[PDB]
Design a protein around this ligand. Structure first.
Ligand code: MET
Ligand SMILES: [K+]
Ligand SMILES: [Mg+2]
Ligand SMILES: [Mg+2]
Ligand SMILES: [Mg+2]
Ligand SMILES: [Mg+2]
Ligand SMILES: [Mg+2]
Ligand SMILES: [Mg+2]
Ligand SMILES: [Mg+2]
Ligand SMILES: [Mg+2]
Ligand SMILES: [Mg+2]
Ligand SMILES: [Mg+2]
Ligand SMILES: [Mg+2]
Ligand SMILES: [Mg+2]
Ligand SMILES: [Mg+2]
Ligand SMILES: [Mg+2]
Ligand SMILES: [Mg+2]
Ligand SMILES: [Mg+2]
Ligand SMILES: [Mg+2]
Ligand SMILES: [Mg+2]
Ligand SMILES: [Mg+2]
Ligand SMILES: [Mg+2]
Ligand SMILES: [Mg+2]
Ligand SMILES: [Mg+2]
Ligand SMILES: [Mg+2]
Ligand SMILES: [Mg+2]
Ligand SMILES: [Mg+2]
Ligand SMILES: [Mg+2]
Ligand SMILES: [Mg+2]
Ligand SMILES: [Mg+2]
Ligand SMILES: [Mg+2]
Ligand SMILES: [Mg+2]
Ligand SMILES: [Mg+2]
Ligand SMILES: [Mg+2]
Ligand SMILES: [Mg+2]
Ligand SMILES: [Mg+2]
Ligand SMILES: [Mg+2]
Ligand SMILES: [Mg+2]
Ligand SMILES: [Mg+2]
Ligand SMILES: [Mg+2]
Ligand SMILES: [Mg+2]
Ligand SMILES: [Mg+2]
Ligand SMILES: [Mg+2]
Ligand SMILES: [Mg+2]
Ligand SMILES: [Mg+2]
Ligand SMILES: [Mg+2]
Ligand SMILES: [Mg+2]
Ligand SMILES: [Mg+2]
Ligand SMILES: [Mg+2]
Ligand SMILES: [Mg+2]
Ligand SMILES: [Mg+2]
Ligand SMILES: [Mg+2]
Ligand SMILES: [Mg+2]
Ligand SMILES: [Mg+2]
Ligand SMILES: [Mg+2]
Ligand SMILES: [Mg+2]
Ligand SMILES: [Mg+2]
Ligand SMILES: [Mg+2]
Ligand SMILES: [Mg+2]
Ligand SMILES: [Mg+2]
Ligand SMILES: [Mg+2]
Ligand SMILES: [Mg+2]
Ligand SMILES: [Mg+2]
Ligand SMILES: [Mg+2]
Ligand SMILES: [Mg+2]
Ligand SMILES: [Mg+2]
Ligand SMILES: [Mg+2]
Ligand SMILES: [Mg+2]
Ligand SMILES: [Mg+2]
Ligand SMILES: [Mg+2]
Ligand SMILES: [Mg+2]
Ligand SMILES: [Mg+2]
Ligand SMILES: [Mg+2]
Ligand SMILES: [Mg+2]
Ligand SMILES: [Mg+2]
Ligand SMILES: [Mg+2]
Ligand SMILES: [Mg+2]
Ligand SMILES: [Mg+2]
Ligand SMILES: [Mg+2]
Ligand SMILES: [Mg+2]
Ligand SMILES: [Mg+2]
Ligand SMILES: [Mg+2]
Ligand SMILES: [Mg+2]
Ligand SMILES: [Mg+2]
Ligand SMILES: [Mg+2]
Lengths: 154, 386
RNA sequence: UUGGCGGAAAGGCCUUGGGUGCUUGCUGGCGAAUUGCAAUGUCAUUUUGCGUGGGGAUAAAUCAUUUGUAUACGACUUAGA
RNA sequence: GCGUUGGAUUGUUCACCCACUAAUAGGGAACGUGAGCUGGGUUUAGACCGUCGUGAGACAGGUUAGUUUUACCCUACUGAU
RNA sequence: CUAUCUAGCGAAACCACAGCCAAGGGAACGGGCUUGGCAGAAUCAGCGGGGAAAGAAGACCCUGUUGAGCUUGACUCUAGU
RNA sequence: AGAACUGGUACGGACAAGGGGAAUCUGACUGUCUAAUUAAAACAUAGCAUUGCGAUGGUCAGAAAGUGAUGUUGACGCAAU
RNA sequence: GUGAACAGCCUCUAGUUGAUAGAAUAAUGUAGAUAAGGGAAGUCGGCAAAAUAGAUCCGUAACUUCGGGAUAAGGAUUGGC
RNA sequence: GCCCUGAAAAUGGAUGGCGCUCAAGCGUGUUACCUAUACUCUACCGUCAGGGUUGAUAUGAUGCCCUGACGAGUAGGCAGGCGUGGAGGUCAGUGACGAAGCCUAGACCGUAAGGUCGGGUCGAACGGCCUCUAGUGCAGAUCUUGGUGGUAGUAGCAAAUAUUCAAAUGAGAACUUUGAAGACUGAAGUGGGGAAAGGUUCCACGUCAACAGCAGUUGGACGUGGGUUAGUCGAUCCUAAGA
RNA sequence: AGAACUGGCGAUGCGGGAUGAACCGAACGUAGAGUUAAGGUGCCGGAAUACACGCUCAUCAGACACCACAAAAGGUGUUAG
RNA sequence: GUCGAAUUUGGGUAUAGGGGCGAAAGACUAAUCGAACCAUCUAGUAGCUGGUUCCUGCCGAAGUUUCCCUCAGGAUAGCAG
RNA sequence: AUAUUGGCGAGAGACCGAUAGCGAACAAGUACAGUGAUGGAAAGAUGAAAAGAACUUUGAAAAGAGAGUGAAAAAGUACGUGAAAUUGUUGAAAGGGAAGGGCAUUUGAUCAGA
């Protein structure tokens, strides 16, 4: 365990994580922030729509010179994308968390994504070859993803 | 050091910024000065540019080399079905300019103009003006009170009119709504004219007449992002130029250490609002009048529409205004024709033009025949027909 | 409550009639203390939330699809029970 | 305010002439402007000549050949959300 | 075919801190200082004015009691003869 | 090689494939070089001329040698210009 | 096969279908083209491009070291049957 | 005297700005007022100087105390101190009931170098004082090594004509396999063999974490194995320039 | 660009000269109060839109030394001799 | 440009650093050439550039004299502790 | 009797404590580079003991969630502690062309002493 800072009830919580996942850390952070706080079923439907290009993931921090689309309007932004790999990883982790909630006996209808955090995994290093016999790094930026879904209560 | 060879600057700095117009309908920013002895009349009209054709007419210009001779001239056709008056707006004057005090709408509005108040008409409940129409419940006391306010105030009176876009061949189906100033005396009678014309059509022949100079206000054809060479007419750089030649070589001196607003830059070309003045009306023709394209010299019973229809527009079925030359905007675009803001007496205006012949050959190619009957007579019998 | 006036940003001004409260215009009766020798010694207006009563109304926009009078992408301009 | 040119020779600035013109005014902006160009000249290395030097070599003397790199950042500007 | 938008992949140069101007004075050409002008989130495509932009401890010039290539009856020597 | 006929007078129908002329400077020519900014008029060249040398020799090597290149050579040669 | 041809172009045997892709079609680019009238006025300079081009027949100047120049220049013809 | 003409330069701009006209301008005179780290008084810190006080409990005579004046500072000198690794002594010092280290807009002491404490983490050593010793204190040196950013999900992954449909496999197919189609190399080949070089890349099976700058079930990848058979082909022998 | 005497800046903060190494004032331990220096007191901006006598009207007024410029020559402008 | 002979080229071989090789450019001699590469002398020397690590307290300068193959340095006296 | 950075065997240190100390605490003159002469690294630490996570569930799988071992998993072989740069989430606050600082106080949060 030892997730990031959470303030929810562990007994009404279910966790899931994936480490050293070879997916863009920036895209995955945007994808996670897109569903942070959402109900679990709503977030899963939204991620499916994103995969289908019906809705977009709004890029808020890692968004310089990316591109503009009308699908960011519902989030009040102009810069949004469809990071399919990040969505696949995040929804696999969401399915795992839903399975863990079911094993714990938690009400699936009351589940919402109470915590989701993506941070940088150690880089996987490759080399690209440059003009005049130069060699530059060609590294990946993989992600550690974690999330916990909790029952909505009062 | 100095420029070393003088040249006029490229482009006009008074048409800045070369940005997209905020609306596809160009605003009328000035109406003719009000003469309050004339009867109440619209100062402008709304039409749709259909296309151009050519005419032949005898030139009346004493002292000219072509006096009493035949000149071929280009003309623009604007499909102008009658506009429906659906409201009146009162304008009071303030130390901060003109200000709309109140607007009084007609009791019944057509679906054409109702669509203008809707982004999604197909899935809406069409509730627009449903409660407003209740102000005409028994005697229209609220409507009369608002009209009384407009009479008591509102040194400027404009009518709200909308096009009958359904009478045009356009697929838009959404009417264009605009304010037209009411010139003529007695703001009280301006309001009376507007109220009496609520829900009623006004034809272009009641606003404009033959030989009249008018102004065309329209958004020009759009061309997207354009380089300096065509956006501003700058000189093409030599073929030897590295990094491209369709550019401006020096976009500024070292000081001021900034690119200046006056330097030609690449950007949006076209889709600009333009008000072009002094276009002479060559015809005020009527759709219900067959032989629209006929003259007293031709007598061939034909409409203004070219063979095969106006290219990308269709057939003219309504009243139409034929103006000399060309006007801003492309075919199918809404244009506003307004009366001239001054009294031009230059023998170019005040010239009475009588068309001898209007071209109705196909504009979809090198049209050879004015009418299908003429094509029949020239070609003889064909295999399919004739 | 009667009526009128006010459009420059009127949102206020004037006025009619009655009801009811106060009146320090004048003359009385009772009360005040202990906040302790002062402590702003809390009296204004500015938004919002929520509850309780009463009145009122019963939409759109965006995405997706479509159009090309538009257009790098956004945007624009069209259509669709 | 508005315009102030087209050319022959010359890398040329300068000059000079032809010609048109209303006029062919003078200048600045890091002697504006090379990640705008070009590279004819000056001003690397090759080579030739003249003069000079014993020589290696010198020459505001002449001649010929001689790689013109990068913007995706910020601002400015042009357009666009 | 790019550029452009998307999926995936994903560097580098550069970086005191940074980034709107006018004038002043100032190491005599400010992004910062002084006085004014002003100044509203987050941005996209271009762009080549500026960042006295980047690239390299100037290669021209001078200094050094720092060299090296080359030349000569410079000084002092030397293989050979 | 020729003749007739034929066609929107097309026809080396795509492909493939010299622009030419009057001159000047310069190097005779073919050839060669600064690989990675100079292909040139620079270098070489045939031709011409000069020089040394008859071998216990000329020219040139080697630290030295009972050592070498020219020389498996001999002036129509070798060596140096 | 065409064609003088191991040229260019198409095909047989054999081999490959490997270069990150999808959507749009702005500017500016890279590569490839066209262009009315004029025809080097552009430019340091015809740079770049265009023009010419194969074959057959005719015709071919100055100059020349008599060998060339020379495809000189300049013309005509070309398919199919 | 004041004012005006004389009095023309380049981004828009400067009595500092606004603005000011019996001035908020100019000349002059009289007051009042504003405020420097200056002056006056006081307190406190330090320094320097001159003194008092071993007459005891009274352990701090380098101490305590009295008096007066003074305090800017680069280069630089000197002095008193703070901190680090190790050493002799001592506190019969701290400590698995938690040493050291580390984190801590929590507290306390010092002018400061720093010191101390609380909390969290942690796991095995460490500290105060008197002295001794030095490889003893970093912001720089285009410093060294390592690590990490903004740039930036950006530049870009655009030469070599070109791919498409279906099925199979597979969790997953633009890229694997089969079939169908469309194309190309067009015999001076994108064909079939070799020399040099490489060294197992050959082939089969399994197999996809990494590599194949997308992908991948595929591979010159990964894991395990199989495979190169000579009297006649070469080397071996000969001599070449030469060693 | 070079000397003389002194005072300064370098090495120096502080108040004033908007701004500035050097000018004016004043040199600096930490604070409190008072008074001042130079400079100021319409507003920025702390402090009299103070008092008093005059002068000046500028279609480029003028507005505090260093200091950020102006001359000869002129004017029934106006003022005083 | 050249393309049948001063042709192109494989392998073998020879020439090795003040040496080679050069149809000659100081060209080439393993991305190194106006003297290759490798190791050592070597931590070469530098009057020249850069950096030079804790606090507080007190005092606190010089750019001047003379001499120097001296003028970016030093000795000397002066200023300072 | 004198010398001895080589070899062999020993005993020591006011030496260094993994960027230090030999280049090499470790399969170091190794991997790797160069035609060659030569050049030449990086790289130590779970825990007392693997007791190295049986079993269940989701997933194609890697892994995740549990369960368990252990004194500790805030020791899971990417392993003692685990700083900084840089980063994610959460919380708080501020934000008209930088930000940061000094004096002074308002406000919010937080806290010592009596
Ligand atoms: C003088 O011209 C100096 N810049 C050096 C010239 S050599 C190209
Ligand atoms: K040299
Ligand atoms: Mg941007
Ligand atoms: Mg881009
Ligand atoms: Mg590359
Ligand atoms: Mg390479
Ligand atoms: Mg000019
Ligand atoms: Mg035009
Ligand atoms: Mg070029
Ligand atoms: Mg047409
Ligand atoms: Mg210049
Ligand atoms: Mg420039
Ligand atoms: Mg340049
Ligand atoms: Mg230039
Ligand atoms: Mg040149
Ligand atoms: Mg030269
Ligand atoms: Mg001579
Ligand atoms: Mg400025
Ligand atoms: Mg200045
Ligand atoms: Mg700057
Ligand atoms: Mg300011
Ligand atoms: Mg650019
Ligand atoms: Mg620039
Ligand atoms: Mg230098
Ligand atoms: Mg140098
Ligand atoms: Mg000297
Ligand atoms: Mg020497
Ligand atoms: Mg030649
Ligand atoms: Mg030949
Ligand atoms: Mg040749
Ligand atoms: Mg070369
Ligand atoms: Mg060349
Ligand atoms: Mg020669
Ligand atoms: Mg043949
Ligand atoms: Mg043409
Ligand atoms: Mg033509
Ligand atoms: Mg011609
Ligand atoms: Mg010319
Ligand atoms: Mg010209
Ligand atoms: Mg010329
Ligand atoms: Mg050419
Ligand atoms: Mg000839
Ligand atoms: Mg010919
Ligand atoms: Mg003042
Ligand atoms: Mg005065
Ligand atoms: Mg004493
Ligand atoms: Mg001091
Ligand atoms: Mg030590
Ligand atoms: Mg501890
Ligand atoms: Mg902290
Ligand atoms: Mg332990
Ligand atoms: Mg040290
Ligand atoms: Mg450091
Ligand atoms: Mg330092
Ligand atoms: Mg550094
Ligand atoms: Mg580094
Ligand atoms: Mg990109
Ligand atoms: Mg590319
Ligand atoms: Mg390709
Ligand atoms: Mg296939
Ligand atoms: Mg081909
Ligand atoms: Mg082919
Ligand atoms: Mg294989
Ligand atoms: Mg890949
Ligand atoms: Mg992959
Ligand atoms: Mg294998
Ligand atoms: Mg044999
Ligand atoms: Mg001087
Ligand atoms: Mg100094
Ligand atoms: Mg001073
Ligand atoms: Mg001043
Ligand atoms: Mg004081
Ligand atoms: Mg004040
Ligand atoms: Mg005078
Ligand atoms: Mg030379
Ligand atoms: Mg040293
Ligand atoms: Mg002192
Ligand atoms: Mg001497
Ligand atoms: Mg110096
Ligand atoms: Mg080591
Ligand atoms: Mg470790
Ligand atoms: Mg522990
Ligand atoms: Mg750890
Ligand atoms: Mg951190
Ligand atoms: Mg902004």
């Amino acid at each position: 365990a030892r997730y990031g800072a959470t303030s929810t009830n562990p007994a009404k919580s279910a966790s899931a994580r994936g480490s050293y996942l070879r997916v863009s850390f920036k895209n995955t952070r945007e994808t996670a922030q897109a569903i942070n706080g959402w109900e679990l079923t709503k977030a899963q439907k939204y991620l499916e729509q994103v995969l289908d290009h019906q809705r977009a993931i709004p890029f808020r921090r890692f968004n310089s010179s990316i591109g503009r689309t009308a699908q960011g309007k519902e989030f009040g932004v102009t810069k949004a994308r469809w990071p399919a790999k990040s969505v696949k990883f995040v929804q696999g982790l969401l399915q795992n968390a839903a399975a863990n909630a079911e094993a714990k006996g938690l009400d699936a209808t009351k589940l919402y994504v109470s915590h989701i955090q993506v941070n940088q995994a150690p880089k996987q290093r490759r080399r690209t070859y440059r003009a005049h016999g130069r060699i530059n790094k060609y590294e990946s930026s993989p992600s550690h993803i974690e999330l916990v879904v909790t029952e909505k209560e009062e | 050091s100095h420029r070393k060879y003088e040249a006029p600057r490229h482009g006009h700095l008074g048409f800045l910024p070369r940005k997209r117009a905020a609306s596809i309908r160009a605003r009328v920013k000035a109406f003719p000065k009000d003469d309050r002895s004339k009867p109440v009349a619209l100062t402008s009209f709304l039409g749709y540019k259909a296309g151009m054709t050519t005419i032949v007419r005898d030139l009346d210009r004493p002292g000219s080399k072509f006096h009493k001779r035949e000149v071929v001239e280009a003309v623009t056709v604007v499909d102008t079905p009658p506009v429906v008056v659906v409201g009146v707006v009162g304008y009071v004057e303030t130390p901060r300019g003109l200000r709309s005090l109140t607007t009084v709408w007609a009791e019944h509005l057509s679906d054409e103009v109702k669509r203008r108040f809707y982004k999604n008409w197909y899935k809406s409940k069409k509730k627009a003006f449903t409660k407003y129409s209740a102000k005409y419940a028994q005697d229209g006391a609220g409507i009369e009170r608002e009209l009384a306010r407009i009479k008591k105030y509102a040194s400027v009176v404009r009518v709200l009119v909308h096009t009958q876009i359904r009478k045009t061949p356009l697929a838009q189906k959404k009417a264009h709504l605009a304010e037209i100033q009411l010139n003529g005396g007695s703001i009280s009678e301006k309001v009376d004219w507007a109220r009496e014309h609520f829900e009623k059509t006004v034809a272009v022949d009641s606003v404009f007449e033959q030989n009249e100079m008018i102004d065309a206000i329209a958004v020009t054809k759009g061309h997207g992002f354009e380089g300096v060479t065509h956006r501003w007419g700058t000189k093409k750089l030599p073929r030897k130029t590295h990094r491209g030649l369709r550019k401006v070589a020096c976009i500024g001196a070292w000081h001021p250490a900034h690119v200046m607003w006056s330097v030609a830059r690449a950007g949006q070309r076209g889709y600009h609002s333009r008000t072009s003045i002094n276009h002479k009306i060559y015809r005020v023709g009527k759709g219900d009048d067959e032989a629209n394209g006929a003259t007293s010299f031709d007598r061939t019973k034909k409409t203004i529409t070219p063979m095969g229809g106006f290219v990308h527009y269709g057939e003219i079925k309504n009243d139409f205004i034929m103006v000399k030359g060309c006007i801003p905007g492309n075919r199918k675009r809404i244009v506003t024709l307004r009366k001239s803001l001054y009294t031009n007496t230059s023998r170019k205006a005040l010239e009475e033009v009588s068309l001898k012949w209007i071209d109705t050959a196909s504009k979809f190619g090198k049209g050879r025949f004015q009418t299908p009957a003429e094509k029949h007579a020239f070609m003889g019998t064909l295999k399919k027909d004739l």
